[PDB]
């Protein structure tokens, strides 16, 4: 039944029944929701799961990505390595205020409400320090 629900999502992209998702199908669904990816961003996204290298996503590749999410060990390690960039002490901790600065000032910045929900979800200590390795296991569970 989980496979059938993935198939129904896959068919929203591949409305023609061709069994593949190209940049046209992916980007069309995304822009209908009000997103505006570039062509190079749509190519990068498809390339992450396109083993055939022909610029498409087929259902086996789609199902694999959906079943896996972030649960794999590669995801847990890389996310933990990203936090460690901002942990100079090396003790596995990061300050709530330092997490807030990085999340709202670097990269694809989180909004205030996004970052508020993120700090609420981490079981912050009374000092104001966050143990990010248990934060990584909650996102990889």
């Amino acid at each position: 039944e989980q496979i059938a629900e993935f198939k129904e999502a896959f068919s929203l992209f591949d409305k023609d029944g061709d069994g593949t998702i190209t940049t046209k199908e992916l980007g069309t669904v995304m822009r209908s929701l009000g997103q505006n990816p570039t062509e190079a961003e749509l190519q990068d996204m498809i390339n992450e799961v396109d083993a055939d290298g022909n610029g498409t996503i087929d259902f086996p590749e789609f199902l694999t990505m959906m079943a896996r999410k972030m649960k794999d060990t590669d995801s847990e390690e890389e996310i933990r390595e990203a936090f460690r960039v901002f942990d100079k002490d090396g003790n596995g901790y990061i300050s709530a205020a330092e997490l807030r600065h990085v999340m709202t000032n670097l990269g694809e910045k989180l909004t205030d409400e996004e970052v508020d929900e993120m700090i609420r979800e981490a079981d912050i200590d009374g000092d104001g320090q966050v143990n990010y390795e248990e934060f990584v296991q909650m996102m990889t569970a």
Binding site: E5, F6, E8, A9, L12, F13, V29, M30, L33, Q35, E41, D44, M45, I46, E48, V49, F62, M65, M66, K69, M70, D74, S75, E78, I79, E81, A82, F83, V85, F86, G90, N91, V102, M103, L106, G107, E108, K109, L110, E114, E117, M118, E121, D125, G126, D127, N131, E134, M138, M139
Partner: protein, 339 residues
């Protein structure tokens, strides 16, 4: 939770103590290594006759110190780990998992001390115990020096096999030839086994000098085969040493490329946005966030590459697109004027 706030500050000192074994490991680890080392050297000296009895009482008073220090530090580490995030239960099991076979030997040596004191070869047994302790305390960081050695030796497996094989071939040739050369003159080479022993001490360049050729033919064969094989019995050290230096230099350059800020920062954001799809107060939408997460993870592993190997092709594509835009502009300019 104010008393539990003092409990949390307890864990604060508890993790601060955790800092010393990992960060400034120097002093603590060295002092404990001296404990074990002193026990060892005192056992050795207890074997020799010169200083025996005083070493015996010192052995008793120091093995009490061993057992009490290890007893303290068992609790120290067990509680010093995650007190309730690595809570006392099933994670308790995982605190006393396999590698706390160190703890097991601790406990059984407690029994050994009790047997020595009130209960009643023995000395060899105790010595071995100290050597198992030696091993563990010099290795409780899971796979450490062992892991590094294994990785590097595996990397150079192909060359190492050659060195080993050729060296062995030279050894068994040389031993046999010399044995034939003077199986009748030297009483030393009375058996091919004798010759093989001589070969093992002549190839590695130990040269005990207990068994040496005496005939002018044996000497020539020994000289030639030594010159030919000694080098082979010294390659593995050379290969491994050089591999270590190469790896060190490489990894310092790779870490020197500390470009990581933005890719690392964006990865946490794409992961949070994906995770929050299933719990935010706010399937196709989730599938898009998974694809973006995977793009962000790669950009991050591309900074764990030194971003140079792909960069050559990256900038080629950029420049090619710039030239394609130039071509298009020129073409449309012609189509605007001339048509």
């Amino acid at each position: 939770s104010a008393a539990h706030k003092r409990y949390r500050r307890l864990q604060n000192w508890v993790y601060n103590v955790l800092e010393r074994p990992r960060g400034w490991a120097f002093v603590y680890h060295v002092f404990i290594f001296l404990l074990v080392f002193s026990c060892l050297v005192l056992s050795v000296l207890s074997t020799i006759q010169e200083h025996q009895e005083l070493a015996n009482e010192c052995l008793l008073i120091l093995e009490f110190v061993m057992i009490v220090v290890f007893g303290l530090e068992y609790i120290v580490r067990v509680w010093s780990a995650g007190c309730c995030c690595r809570y006392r239960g099933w994670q308790g099991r995982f605190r006393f998992a396999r590698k706390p076979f160190c703890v097991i030997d601790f406990i059984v040596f407690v029994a050994s001390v009790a047997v020595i004191a009130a209960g009643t070869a023995t000395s060899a047994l105790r010595s071995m115990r100290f050597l198992q302790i030696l091993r563990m305390v010099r290795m409780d960081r899971r796979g450490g020096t062992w892991k590094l050695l294994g990785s590097v030796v595996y990397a150079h497996s192909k060359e190492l096999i050659t060195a080993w094989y050729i060296g062995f071939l030279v050894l068994i040739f040389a031993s046999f030839l010399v044995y034939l050369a003077e199986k009748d003159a030297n009483s030393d080479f009375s058996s091919y086994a004798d010759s093989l022993w001589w070969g093992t001490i002549t190839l590695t360049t130990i040269g005990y000098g207990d068994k040496t050729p005496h005939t002018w033919l044996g000497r020539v064969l020994a000289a030639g085969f030594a010159l030919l094989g000694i080098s082979f019995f010294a390659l593995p050290a050379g290969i491994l040493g050089s591999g270590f230096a190469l790896k060190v230099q490489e990894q310092h350059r790779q870490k020197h490329f500390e470009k990581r800020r933005m890719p690392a920062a964006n990865l946490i954001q794409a992961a949070w946005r994906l995770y929050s799809t299933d719990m935010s107060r706010a399937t196709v939408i989730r599938s898009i966030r998974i694809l973006k997460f995977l793009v962000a993870k790669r950009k991050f592993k591309e900074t764990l590459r030194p971003y140079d190997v792909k960069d050559v092709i990256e900038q080629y594509s950029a420049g090619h697109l710039d030239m394609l835009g130039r071509i298009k502009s020129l073409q449309t300019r012609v189509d605007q004027i001339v048509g």
